[PDB]
Design a protein around this ligand. Structure first.
Ligand SMILES: C[C@H](NC(=O)c1c(N)nn2cccnc12)c1cc2cccc(C#Cc3cnn(C)c3)c2c(=O)n1-c1ccccc1
Length: 835
């Protein structure tokens, strides 16, 4: 069909990679996967409700927190409903549905009308009490009135989906290696299963020539039958240093033992990270190192009661943290008493890490154990635990599948919380098709909000990671074929605008080097390029990728500008295309090159999780995880927080610092004394929040230039990629303390409170130690370009694993005192080392 080839062309532009391309593939797993993902696509497409899908209501089954109960008048909530002009405030109890409140309204075609939010693509619809809608909870947190506009439901017609159309020892021959351009070298051959080396053979050393030929059989001690599925033949070249690596799945996607002539182009090194695991080969055929190999070698098809001191010992092991490495003794015990270990869900990661995966007999027994998982099946979903099983330590389908099963019960609100980290977790899958990928796919097709971010998270990786672009593309394509016509058009708009505004960000950066500030003619160039794009190619309105509720429209070219930090990022402002919008405040977007934003995304997604945790223990520390989306290599977009400045500028209104300046800025920006005291309170929460959060994540030691505050006193850290690219545990400088009214070594009402909020928040995180450890662990492995055990075991020390709550109270309070004793020392030292 000529239609499908235009559609397939249409798809490739949205993805930024061609899945039909067969240049860098030596098997058809990628094609097999595309075929495979039709069934679950079409199933989910078929079973999804037209109406609710179109309106995509954002709701939660969670309780309303205490702090939001206290913000309510008298079991009564004021909703303001709008026509084309006039409006009426309605009194409503939190437990009313959108239908019930609609019935109550018309008293003052009833089922032909829906309560849309004013200024947003956000509907308050469906059998959910008004309190359970996220937009309502946002309004209640902020203390803003809840404004809606009655109008027609969106047409499901628009979400139309296009109809689609041997006991033999294993051995490998190393032929040799080959590269055009450039010591002693050898080829190391590893058989791995969940970064666990089963056997290793090293080829004899030879001179480091462009073409090194061996023609040698590396014979292993593992039988062919004993190879487990998802076993990777890891080939690495050495010289005391590792230079190149490549992987080959010894067992393929059809359960067949891999055989035949292979020539694999290798990835160069820039110990462990996600990129090391990829079955993909280097696409750059001209520069890269190749290796030639040959494979010829066949499908893969009443208990006595525990002692006290053993159950003790077992329960000890299971209780410990995920980074706690298991002794051989621990694993033998876990395995021997596996049927008892199966009764404890929190043993599972450890228990499956105790399996000999190089023994068909043991693997088979392992599988008999998973058949009797009534305990797991009935266990309350533990997300942290479920993540552990999807990390790099487990490369077994069945094991990994029980984790994915447990995720099925996640509400859409919770999926979003974890979606980024769950996309990154695909890097740990051994095969392109996997229960995880299908889960992602299914949940995105079910809910347009999840679908939207999924698009951007996959695309983020497709556009830079050569190690994983092929896999993510196939998954993305799969989603795009099911999301519907209204979304397709949305994404096309979005991607065009993004690519447009990237060119400008890059082109403007070419015009002025890091060496000097903004030029007049460069500003003149800027405002012409925008004039040009607005008039020529900018669409009338596009959806904001970091906040898909909001639709941005026409540029405020007057209000646009460019900074001078040598990064030279843009600062764009747009009118909101929605005329029903309550305010005329712009939509502020910052476009920047030269900064890796994948890091920022992950840190922020963790912040959002830390807030969700705190909500469960009746706490809100006014964190501000702004919108941020990596769009390509070193390029992304950032949400501009309105009425916000940096702590640095406040101080400069060389390297001299005054403690009071911060306090005076708040007095200046608050009209009323009450609003000053409200903002001083917001500062104490937000400071404590960011103090705790950054301490746990090992990123507290920032420069003032990297910290900001809103005019309403909401402090919030920024530029997290910068840190991950004489010390203090976190920024709690003398100015921050002067707001609280304490100076030197003293104490006051707000400082005594600050400390109450810190510890409470800190100990709340410790209640989810295991979750944060795994998210943090995973962040390092999938977020950073280059990671080690020493790094990962920081969070262990920062969360003070295996301790009482009072030693932890002590620890953190000591950390406060360290900040005070140092004062300005560290802030000062940046200027000193700069200059
Ligand atoms: C660092 C600061 N960041 C934010 O404002 C901010 C926000 N609002 N949301 N957000 C979310 C994540 C990260 N950052 C943020 C910031 C960014 C920026 C980005 C692009 C261009 C310019 C500019 C400019 C300009 C124009 N003419 N002249 C003389 C300077 C700027 C800029 O001036 N500032 C800045 C503001 C106040 C004091 C010091 C610097």
């Amino acid at each position: 069909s000529e239609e499908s080839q235009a559609f397939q062309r249409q798809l490739t532009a949205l993805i930024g990679y061609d899945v039909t391309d067969v240049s860098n593939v030596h098997d058809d797993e990628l094609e097999f996967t595309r075929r495979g993902l039709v069934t679950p696509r079409m199933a989910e497409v078929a079973s999804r409700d037209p109406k609710l899908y179109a309106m995509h209501p954002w709701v939660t089954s969670k309780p309303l927190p205490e702090y939001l109960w206290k913000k309510i008048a008298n079991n009564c909530i004021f909703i303001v409903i709008h026509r084309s002009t006039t409006s009426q405030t309605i009194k409503v109890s939190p437990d009313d549905t959108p239908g019930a409140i609609l019935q109550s309204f018309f008293t003052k075609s009833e089922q032909d009308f829906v309560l849309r939010v004013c200024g947003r693509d956000e509907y308050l619809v469906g059998e959910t009490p008004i309190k359970n809608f996220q937009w309502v909870r946002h309004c209640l947190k902020n203390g803003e009135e809840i404004h809606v506009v009655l109008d027609t439901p969106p047409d499901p017609a628009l979400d139309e989906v296009r109809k689609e159309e041997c006991d033999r020892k294993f051995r490998v021959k190393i032929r040799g290696i080959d590269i055009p351009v450039l010591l002693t070298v050898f080829v190391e051959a590893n058989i791995q299963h969940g970064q666990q080396v089963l056997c290793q053979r090293r080829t004899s050393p030879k001179p480091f020539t462009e073409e090194v030929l061996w023609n040698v059989w590396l014979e292993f001690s593992i039988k062919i039958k004993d190879l487990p599925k998802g076993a990777l033949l890891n080939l690495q070249i050495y010289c005391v240093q590792l230079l190149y690596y490549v992987n080959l799945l010894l067992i393929d996607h059809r359960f067949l033992l891999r055989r035949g002539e292979y020539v694999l182009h290798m990835w160069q090194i820039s110990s462990f990270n996600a990129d090391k695991l990829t079955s993909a080969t280097n696409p750059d055929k001209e520069n890269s190192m190749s290796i030639s190999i040959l494979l010829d070698n066949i499908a893969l098809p009443v208990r006595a009661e525990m002692p006290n001191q053993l159950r003790k010992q077992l329960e000890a092991i299971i209780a410990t943290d995920p980074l706690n490495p298991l002794t051989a003794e621990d694993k033998e015990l876990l395995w021997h008493f596996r049927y008892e270990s199966l009764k404890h869900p929190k043993a599972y990661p450890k228990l499956f890490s105790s399996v000999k995966w190089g023994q068909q007999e043991i693997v088979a027994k392992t599988y008999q154990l998973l058949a009797r998982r009534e305990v797991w099946d009935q266990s309350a979903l533990d997300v942290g635990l479920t993540m552990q099983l999807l990390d790099c330590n487990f490369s077994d389908e069945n094991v990994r599948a029980i984790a994915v099963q447990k995720l099925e019960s996640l509400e859409d609100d919770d999926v979003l919380h974890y979606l980024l980290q769950l996309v990154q977790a695909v890097k740990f899958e051994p095969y392109h098709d996997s229960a995880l990928a299908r889960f992602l796919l299914k949940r995105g097709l079910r809910n347009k909000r999840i679908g939207h971010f999924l698009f951007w998270f996959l695309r983020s990786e497709i556009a830079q990671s050569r190690h994983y672009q092929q896999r993510f593309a196939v998954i993305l394509e799969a989603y795009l074929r099911g999301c519907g016509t209204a979304m397709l058009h949305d994404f096309t708009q979005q991607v065009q605008v993004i690519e447009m505004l990237q060119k400008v960000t890059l082109d403007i950066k070419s015009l002025s080097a890091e060496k000097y500030d903004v030029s007049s003619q460069v500003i003149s160039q800027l405002k012409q390029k925008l004039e040009n794009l607005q008039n020529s190619q900018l669409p009338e309105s596009f959806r904001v990728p970091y906040d898909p509720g909001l639709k941005a429209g026409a540029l405020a070219i007057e209000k646009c500008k460019v900074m001078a930090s040598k990064k030279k990022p843009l600062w764009l402002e747009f009118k909101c295309a929605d005329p029903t919008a309550l305010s005329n405040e712009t939509i502020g977007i910052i476009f920047k090159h030269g900064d890796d934003l994948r890091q920022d995304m992950l840190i922020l997604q963790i912040l959002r999780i830390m807030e969700s945790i705190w909500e469960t223990e009746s706490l809100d520390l006014c964190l501000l995880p702004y919108g941020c989306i990596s769009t390509g290599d070193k390029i992304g977009m950032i949400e501009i927080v309105k009425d916000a400045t940096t702590i640095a500028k406040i101080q400069q209104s060389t390297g001299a610092f005054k403690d009071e300046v911060l306090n005076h800025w708040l007095k200046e920006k608050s009209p009323t004394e009450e609003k000053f005291q409200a903002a001083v309170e917001r500062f104490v929460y937000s400071c404590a929040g960011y103090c705790v959060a950054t301490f746990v994540l090992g990123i507290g030691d920032r420069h003032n230039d990297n910290i900001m505050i809103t005019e309403t006193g909401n402090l919030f850290h920024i530029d997290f990629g910068h840190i991950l690219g004489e010390r203090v545990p976190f920024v709690l400088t003398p100015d921050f303390l002067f707001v609280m009214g304490t100076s030197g070594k003293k104490t006051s009402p707000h400082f005594q409170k600050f400390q109450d909020i810190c510890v409470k928040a800190y100990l709340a995180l410790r209640h989810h130690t295991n979750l944060l450890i795994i998210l943090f662990s995973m962040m390092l492995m999938t977020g950073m370009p280059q990671t080690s055990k020493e790094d990962i075991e920081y969070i262990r020390d920062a969360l003070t694993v295996g301790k009482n709550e009072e030693d932890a109270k002590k620890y953190f309070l000591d950390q406060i005192e360290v900040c005070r004793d140092k004062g300005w020392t560290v802030q000062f030292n940046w200027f000193l080392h700069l200059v």
